[PDB]
Design a protein around this ligand. Structure first.
Ligand SMILES: CC(=O)N[C@H]1[C@H]([C@H](O)[C@H](O)CO)O[C@@](O[C@@H]2[C@@H](O)[C@H](O)O[C@H](CO)[C@@H]2O)(C(=O)O)C[C@@H]1O
Ligand SMILES: *[C@@H]1O[C@H](CO)[C@@H](O)[C@H](O)[C@H]1NC(C)=O
Ligand SMILES: *[C@@H]1O[C@H](CO)[C@@H](O)[C@H](O)[C@H]1NC(C)=O
Ligand SMILES: *[C@@H]1O[C@H](CO)[C@@H](O)[C@H](O)[C@H]1NC(C)=O
Ligand SMILES: *[C@@H]1O[C@H](CO)[C@@H](O)[C@H](O)[C@H]1NC(C)=O
Lengths: 173, 325, 330, 173, 325, 172
């Protein structure tokens, strides 16, 4: 997709993550789970809701066609009315259909970007204390606690704290 | 070792959107913006019923064709429904002049109030009681006339004198009224009904003048009539006065309408039912919260925007890529 | 030397440019022009139907049967009409063709007409059919003639111009387009000479229509050496309808008329001097044929057939490839 | 450009890469050459083609102007016809011209993105088994023959297989 | 402890906000308002050309030459017309100015008129040209006057009213706008006193125009103490065209007419002041002095104005999201 | 943000950086301060200026209302004119308002991308001679001179020149 994450280097989504659009999956000696990142999810919900409402608001005008009759001496003005009314119909049908195609493209890209930025947020915290498997997964070189997992998620990961354990594990391999 | 992975939501949705780049994309969440569904009936708008003209056209109603008596009084309406196969219109053949403007003026109203504008006594020394024709039966009388007009004829013995009438609109509402000019087929019918000599119909107000005289000739038979009536309408503004003067061939105004006051005239066969609506189209009621609709550009009330589209579905969710089980 | 792998993109010899919101004159490797600006400066057939060339005749000259328009006389089938800007043969006896614009609109709507005698000269009794010709309306052979579709009726040697009557009942399934006139003499003397003394009228009716007119006698500035005028009129007699004609005098009677077929095409009346040739077109504009697959065109808003959308744009080039950044060679 | 690859950290294009929009250039003891990334180019082709066909389809109605004559008592309705036809001409000229400027901006960005994602994809496979030379080029810290090159292009590069060799050479320098 | 280099972005004291599809009220560092909502409440010159202030006269009062509209009388050139909504001097003798709306549209298209004597009074032979005044059309100085551009022709004290005739050939370069009328007495007594006995007509014609009218006698309601009416007419004599006039009685003759010279025309109906000011864009509600692209002031304007839209504000972000510390 | 830098991993802006949209904040023994990246700033200004002028240029036509008069027998054509003029009014009003919302979204994104691409430009220069902190800031493993800071800003940073000094501290 344009940021390359969704249906990209993260090949699939998670039916097991039901509480958010974007999330973390973890496994550790204490268990495993799928959990949404609430801030990025809620921000995205607020934006998309706003996009939908803005479009609805912008579209809330109506062009009104009319029931008027015209005589056998009014072919010109009768046709003028028909061309006028068909004209606005074609303009608005165009405006709505194109807007939908364009905004659907850009909405999917916004989701892709939010996933991508989440992934980069973790990768810059972990540095060489973890190994990039593919598919947006990292394997820690150290034991990573539930508390450690929460620290990666809320951006408080203490790299130095695990640097020695990590290096020792890294090259033992 | 321990894993942390980053990812996104999937679900069992099979609903698709299109994109400039890609068609048929399954997404986890989305909103359809277009309404394609309608109740095929007419309902009240603003808790106000529409006027069903039934077997009468607008002409038959407002001129008062004798067969249109069901519609005779005051009427208040939210819109008008005219049935396409309505057979009672102009019964005595002729042209209702500026017909299209009359239909638009009537469509812009919401109420009329019928009242006697010119009592028959207004016109002295003529006969106001013989003005009927087999072209205009009621359902019970084989020869009648418009309820809103008087077909004046000369008295049995006397010549047709100059008749005159005035009506002063001292009210606050415009008055819609009607008159006509008889064009006999023959100079014989002409002399029988009216005097010998040149005849005229003249009318005026502060802002309007009318003058017309009979165009005597035989036209193709319509409801057995080779003669014709030219019908006319006008609107007497509040404060205005109408003067009427004629020495023959006048089809006089009798009853008129105080006229009050978007309006619509729907030509349709749909039934009017005991129901309410906020959006009424010519092909049905929309009961919806959608932004667009493909039902009809012709409506009354508050409707969504008409477009030719089949669907306008907006992705709100992400692309749906659930695990293959 | 160390082994390399590099990531990069296509460049080519394209010198073609596009504009974007952020930047003008961007050279791109691939692009599509969406707008057509080329045309063939001629008229071709549409739906394999030839258009009608009025040549040196206007639309008025044609359907009234101006004697000089005899080439077009008769039966006509067309996909559109071409009227030359300086056609000379129109209304030869001066006067107004009433509701002209709405006539031109009605004719444009049609796809074919069949000429036929509507009222034979015999229809009118006690009057002279033969004498109605004028120098204002010559043919290309006789100097005094009259429109093919009308009879200018005159009273005979007797003082009286009698009441004349004519009926045509349309039993045919097709509307009939027909014409008539009322003649307005410059003076009372000409009025006396041509028609009966006293009040004159022309009255006509159908189930749906009425018409009454009397002569309006006055001297008017000379046109074609005529200070008198004719009021020309036209109407359409629906299938099943009957026409009654009655006149005291001053009648220019309908003689020949046209069975009229309306079309499912647009259709059009192009005022233009461009040549008509034996060619085929899908899209005919008033300034020429478009023969194109483009979405947009800047040739003309006026056309018949299937044309691209008209815009004022000079070019509508969509990028499809990427920015073209070829290596500099010296 | 917005993703910063095209005319960016990768300065120029390749006239020599003739089989695709986006690609690889390689050099090794066996040889040197250009090869398009087929998968990313073909997806871009499909997408851009869909865009072009969508624009064409939404633009496939035509307002119709008419030849009608007006008399010298029809100045108002003649001007009404004129202002109406010109009105729709101006709306459609605006729609088409703005859409092209807009979509041209976004199509160049889409290409920019596909190049950057292709770059990042290789970067994350090679890790520290290769050295960034700049201009979107990596120099390997190990021998990388044709099958090795292919595996980078295929997405199947084996970092473990070459990690000892590349680590030894990284030291030697 | 180590040295640092950080990458970042501008912030500032801006409290100016924009809206986007995703978010409302976004404070941005730099932005531009594309919409103009301010105006000067007055009328200004346009291409250094003053507009025509009709003052206490309507367009009708002005070009028929209502006697109270004398200030207007003579040549005029203008950048647009200002008609005051309460102007009282219009059609002073009651009647209809036929094809009025179409006259108002033609006058609007113009930039200048030159008034000239089209038909000297001497043109009409055997009639009285000095008595055609009325108490319904007073000047400021006399109780009984008439339109300055027309002559109400009446019988010479010794009967009868003869056939009168006049011709004018437009040899000039410019179209000519002119006027005439037909008098419609309330009585046959007024008819016989002013004009002859006998059937009266008013006929006019050019190479391309035909006109014929005869009087329509009847009493209309009193307007300015008149139950008679005048039907007023206008036309345009093209360059090279000749006008022939011929009447028998009841003709209100063309006397003075206008050489008419014809961009964008404007007739503004407004009470705003005209000041000694210059402008490039003039709206019916005032001057826009502005560089902006859009304006929410009025759809009715002359000059080079911004595009009219119903928007309150159209502010484009140019800088970035403002996040100061 | 869509590119995630502005109001994102770079949490706030710099009131101190007065002369540019995007730029650098350094700290060293000689001091600290702000410097705009001139090239990316001017390119954005050029782009945004072009966008504004394109919009203004495309919006340069006008639909003109007339206020002709209509008689009491011209209700239909009078209404036709009104609906016609109101119709074009509604289309242009829609066109202007929608375009401003859309373009505003894209302009904020563009600024976000320019910041991100600047951050990546530096990042790829510095390599492991510096620690990438979470926040668009890099902490050097070596002493970085005002001259050193300048070269980072100019794209002329010399990684080998500081590689061994950096290795020492990065491990020591
Ligand atoms: C049917 C008929 O009477 N035709 C006449 C014709 C008409 O009577 C006339 O056009 C109506 O006024 O008039 C013709 O003679 C013309 C003269 O009326 C006129 O003074 O000068 C003309 C040439 O200058 C011409 O002589 C005509 O128009 O041809 C004779 C025709 O038979
Ligand atoms: C026209 O023709 C039909 C069929 O002959 C006939 O019934 C009808 O009466 C005709 N019209 C008149 C007026 O004769
Ligand atoms: C390229 O630039 C020239 C002038 O600099 C200009 O006329 C042309 O429109 C630009 N090309 C486009 C629009 O792609
Ligand atoms: C905001 O900034 C401008 C330029 O820095 C300055 O002139 C103005 O005084 C400041 N406004 C305030 C907060 O008063
Ligand atoms: C009007 O004047 C022109 C030139 O002086 C002349 O040729 C033309 O005959 C005149 N028109 C008439 C018929 O009076």
């Amino acid at each position: 997709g344009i940021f390359g994450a969704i249906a990209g280097f993260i090949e699939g989504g998670w039916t097991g993550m039901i509480d958010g659009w974007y999330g973390y999956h973890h496994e550790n000696s204490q268990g495993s789970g799928y959990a949404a990142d609430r801030e990025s999810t809620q921000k995205a919900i607020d934006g998309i809701t706003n996009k939908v409402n803005s479009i609805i608001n912008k579209m809330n005008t109506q062009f009104e066609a009319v029931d008027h009759e015209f005589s056998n001496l009014e072919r010109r003005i009768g046709n003028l009315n028909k061309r006028m009314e068909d004209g606005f119909l074609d303009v608005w049908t165009y405006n709505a259909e194109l807007l939908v195609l364009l905004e659907n493209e850009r909405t999917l890209d916004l989701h892709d970007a939010n996933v991508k930025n989440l992934y980069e947020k973790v990768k810059s915290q972990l540095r060489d204390n973890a190994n990039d498997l593919g598919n947006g997964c990292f394997e820690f070189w150290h034991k990573c606690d539930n508390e450690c997992m929460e620290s990666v998620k809320n951006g408080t990961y203490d790299y130095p704290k695990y640097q020695k354990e990590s290096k020792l594990n890294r090259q033992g391999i | 070792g321990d894993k942390i992975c980053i990812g996104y939501h999937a679900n069992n949705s099979t609903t698709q959107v299109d994109t400039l780049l890609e068609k048929n994309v399954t997404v986890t969440h989305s909103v359809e913006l277009l309404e394609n569904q309608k109740e095929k009936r007419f309902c009240k708008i603003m808790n106000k019923a529409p006027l069903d003209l039934k077997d009468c056209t607008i002409e038959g109603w407002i001129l008062g064709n004798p067969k249109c008596d069901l519609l005779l009084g005051d009427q208040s309406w939210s819109y008008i429904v005219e049935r396409p196969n309505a057979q009672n219109g102009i019964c005595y053949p002729g042209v209702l002049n500026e017909l299209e403007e009359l239909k638009a003026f009537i469509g812009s109203g919401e109420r009329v109030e019928r009242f006697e504008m010119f009592p028959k006594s207004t016109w002295a020394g003529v006969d106001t009681s013989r003005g009927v024709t087999n072209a205009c039966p009621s359902y019970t009388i084989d020869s009648s006339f418009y309820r809103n007009l008087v077909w004046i004829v000369k008295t049995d013995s006397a010549t047709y004198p100059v008749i005159k009438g005035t009506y002063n609109n001292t009210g606050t509402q415009p008055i819609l009224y009607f008159w006509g000019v008889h064009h006999p087929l023959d100079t014989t019918v002409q002399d029988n009904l009216y005097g010998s000599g040149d005849k005229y119909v003249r009318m005026g107000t502060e802002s309007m003048n009318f003058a017309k005289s009979p165009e005597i000739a035989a036209r193709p038979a319509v409801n057995d009539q080779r003669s014709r009536i030219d019908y006319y309408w006008s609107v007497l503004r509040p404060g205005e006065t109408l003067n009427v003067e004629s020495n023959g061939n006048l089809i006089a105004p009798w009853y008129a309408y105080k006229f009050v006051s978007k309006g619509a005239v729907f030509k349709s066969d749909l039934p009017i039912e005991n129901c309410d609506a906020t959006c009424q189209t010519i092909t049905g009621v929309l009961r919806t919260n959608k932004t667009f609709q493909n039902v009809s550009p012709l409506w009354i009330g508050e409707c969504p925007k008409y477009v030719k589209s089949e669907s306008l579905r907006l992705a709100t969710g992400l692309r749906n890529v659930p695990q293959i089980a």
